[PDB]
């Protein structure tokens, strides 16, 4: 009843490590939202000169 | 030189990215911390007429919540930049409803340029900046403690909760670099956060006026 | 946990590492007091449950207050006023050095 | 002018920097002292740490950095110039009145040309300095005093 | 809603010491029994150990309301 | 060292806390939150170690 207590905080461990991933692909789609804004910027920064 | 206006408009772009990030208009986290080799591989490191010429390397980036406020970074050639640069510049804004721009001016504008300046202010915001200004970023220093522009609810909410009008919070004239980094304007009040050495932490408000 | 985020805190907050400070209580002289008054002996095993300790220093902290009021601004700047008195107050009394 | 080129000896100018083990360690790096004031071309210069080059000057750096960096410096500096002696002042007295120096935003001298330009009261200016001048200019702007000061 | 701190400021305590005694001088009466002392003033401070001064605080503050303590609501210092 | 005692006192006379636990001047203005950044006199202060 121990090494039960103990497997529950182990599956806590998991989930915030799940959580990180999720984090982790939150940053994944920033950076993918800002890649696909500046495909669209770099027309006017070169139409600016 | 060629090498150090290299490194100095580099660190320039590099002032200007966290300036703008710190307001809150979304920047990669790349171009944020970009090295300069990259830079160099970018443009071609060749300022001295060549490749790397300004107002070429002009940054526009949108606010982070609302996409449809942008603001312009130029930089104009001019050394003593006159009246007709600016002129020209706001025209070419007006194309779009884009309504902020930061200057970056090699020397001191002319005082009739800031006339000017000022004069288009309530329909267009734009701000100038010496790069020697900007070669280094202030915010970073140990002594400036962390600013927190505050929203006008949570004014209200901090007036209201001390009972104190806002006439009586600390001043802080607009010309402060501080100020003119992050923007603020009149009427408008700035959250400071100070490391406390008998209080651990202290926060202040000051109200620019 | 917590302690360790109070270190943290302090190491971020007094750099240079200056431990000596000025604060309103000295907790070292008012536990030599209780100890002197209530002949604690500190030899014998002591009847003093952790958790009881950890909820009197809870309870303690809320009582200590600076900025009255329950308002999010009001309990923001309580946390602040008295934040490096708290922490002092975590680091000497502890389950650990309490026992 | 000139600068010079002194190791530091004490605490106060050693890098501190905190080691993986925990220690802090502090560390002995060269530092520059100089003559004059500059400051916003020397932070510019590459190799310059810019984040601890201070300045040791109020004015310059509410130029540079900005009114609450002017207030941090001017701490610093009093409490630099109050402890040379050995002698301790509680930080109180001196937050006090670094505030009460920058509370307006500006640097407020505490000469009469920095205390009377504030709106206290022309019976207040009076008691300091510039009696028959401060009267006289109330009296002729019709100002009021609203009777709280000591 | 007084958000005022619950203690008496030594300021208070001498000023409600000073006044009770001058009110006792003037032959105003007392709220304790004497023990078969007469100076106004160490009556006025054993007066303020019962808890029995007719007397009501209004501390102001800084907005301009303010708030009416009684000098048996609040803790004393000394 | 008189005449910047004077000056001293004369820039700082009407500075108080109020009741409403703030430090404050003739004219109302708030200087400090709290006095002293954290509201305790300095009289009952002793030096400690963390």
């Not at chain 5, 808890?51 to 102001?60: A, F, H, N």
């Not at chain 6, 004077?6 to 006379?13: G, H, N, V």
């Amino acid at each position: 009843k121990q090494e039960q207590e103990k497997e529950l905080l182990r599956q806590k461990l998991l989930k915030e490590q799940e959580e990180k991933r999720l984090r982790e692909k939150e940053e994944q789609k920033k950076l993918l939202e800002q890649r696909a804004q500046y495909v669209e910027k770099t027309k006017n920064i070169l139409m600016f000169t | 030189d060629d090498e150090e206006e290299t490194y100095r408009l580099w660190k320039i772009r590099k002032t200007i990215m966290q300036l703008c990030h710190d307001r809150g208009y979304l920047v990669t986290q790349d171009e944020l911390d970009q090295t300069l080799e990259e830079f160099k591989a970018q443009f071609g490191d060749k300022p001295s007429e060549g490749r790397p010429r300004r107002t070429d390397l002009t940054v526009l980036v949108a606010h982070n919540d609302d996409p449809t406020d942008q603001m312009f970074v130029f930089f104009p050639e001019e050394p003593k930049v006159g009246i007709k640069t600016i002129k020209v510049y706001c025209q070419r804004m007006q194309e779009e409803n884009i309504t902020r721009a930061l200057i970056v001016v090699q020397q001191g504008m002319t005082p009739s340029a800031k006339q000017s300046l000022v004069d288009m202010a309530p329909k267009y915001i734009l701000e100038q900046f010496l790069q020697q200004e900007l070669l280094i970023n202030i915010t970073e220093h140990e002594l400036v403690p962390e600013h927190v522009v505050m929203t006008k609810e949570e004014v209200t909410e901090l007036l209201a909760r001390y009972k104190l009008r806002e006439n009586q919070l600390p001043r802080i004239q607009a010309g402060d670099p501080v100020a003119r980094y992050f923007g603020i304007k009149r009427g408008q009040v700035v959250k400071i956060i100070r490391p406390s050495e008998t209080a651990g932490r202290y926060i202040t408000y000051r109200l620019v006026q | 946990e917590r302690m360790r985020e109070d270190r943290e805190v302090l190491r971020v907050i007094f750099p240079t590492g200056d431990s000596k400070v000025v604060l309103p209580c000295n907790l070292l002289r008012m536990i030599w007091n209780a100890q002197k008054i209530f002949h604690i002996n500190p030899r014998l095993p002591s009847d003093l449950h952790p958790i009881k300790v950890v909820e009197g220093v809870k309870e303690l902290s809320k009582k200590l207050v600076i900025v009255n009021g329950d308002d999010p601004l009001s309990r923001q700047a309580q946390e602040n006023a008295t934040l490096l008195f708290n922490i002092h107050l975590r680091s000497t009394l502890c389950s650990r050095r309490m026992a | 002018s000139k600068v010079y080129m002194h190791l530091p000896q004490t605490d106060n100018k050693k890098k501190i920097i905190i080691t993986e083990d925990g220690e802090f360690k502090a560390l002995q790096e060269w530092i520059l002292e100089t003559d004059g004031v500059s400051l916003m071309r020397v932070l510019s210069e590459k190799d310059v740490d810019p984040v601890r080059t201070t300045s040791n000057d109020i004015v310059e750096i509410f130029t540079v950095l900005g009114i609450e960096a002017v207030r941090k410096a001017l701490e610093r500096e009093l409490y630099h110039v109050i402890s040379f002696d050995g002698s301790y002042v509680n930080y109180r007295h001196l937050a006090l009145l670094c505030d009460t120096m920058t509370c307006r935003g500006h640097l407020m001298a505490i000469t009469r040309h920095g205390v009377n330009r504030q709106d206290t009261g022309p019976l207040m200016k009076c008691s300091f300095e510039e009696t028959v001048d401060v009267l006289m200019e109330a009296a002729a702007h019709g100002e009021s005093d609203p009777m709280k000061g000591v | 809603k007084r958000i005022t701190t619950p203690y008496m400021t030594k300021y208070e305590r001498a000023r409600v010491l000073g006044t009770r005694a001058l009110q006792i001088a003037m032959c105003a009466p007392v709220m304790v029994e004497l023990e078969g002392e007469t100076d106004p003033l160490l009556i006025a401070m054993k007066e303020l150990k019962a808890r029995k001064i007719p007397i009501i605080i209004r501390r102001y503050l800084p907005d301009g309301s303010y708030e009416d303590w009684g000098v048996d609501e609040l803790i004393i210092s000394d | 060292t008189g005449y910047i005692q004077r000056r001293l006192i004369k820039s700082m006379e009407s500075v108080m806390v109020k009741y409403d636990a703030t430090v404050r001047n003739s004219i109302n203005q708030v200087v400090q939150l709290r006095y002293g950044e954290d509201g305790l006199a300095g009289e009952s202060v002793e030096f400690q170690n963390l």
